[PDB]
Amino acid sequence: VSYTPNSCCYGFQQHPPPVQILKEWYPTSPACPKPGVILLTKRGRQICADPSKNWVRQLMQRLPAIAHH
């Protein structure tokens, strides 16, 4: 849908989550002003994280990249 809303992070989580709760990750929309990733937890919590941060890239590497929709 050319008129669908876009999911974006306005604010990122600055402190690393516990790896044990993380399931997978996926990027937010390319339409967003600041590029983001979601770290999705086993309980389904969507954690906004900044892929310009090395610690976020390292978690990303350890997790499967799995499209949400």
Domain CATH number, residue 33: 2.40.50.40
Residues 6+ away with beta carbon under 8 Å from 40: 22, 23, 24, 25, 26, 46, 47, 66, 68
Residue 49 lies in a domain: yes
**Look-up of token digits 């876009």:** 6
The alpha carbons of the chain give a radius of gyration, in whole angstroms, of 12
Method for structure elucidation: X-ray
Residues 24, 46 contacting (CB under 8 angstroms):
no
3-state helix, strand, coil in the chain (%, to 5): 15, 25, 60
Closest CA relative to residue 50, chosen from 17, 19, 18, 20: 17
Range of the domain at 11: 6-66
Residue 1 lies in a domain: no
Number of domains in the chain: 1
Residue 21 lies in a domain: yes
Distance set, CA 32 to CA 10, 11, 28 (Å): 9, 12, 7
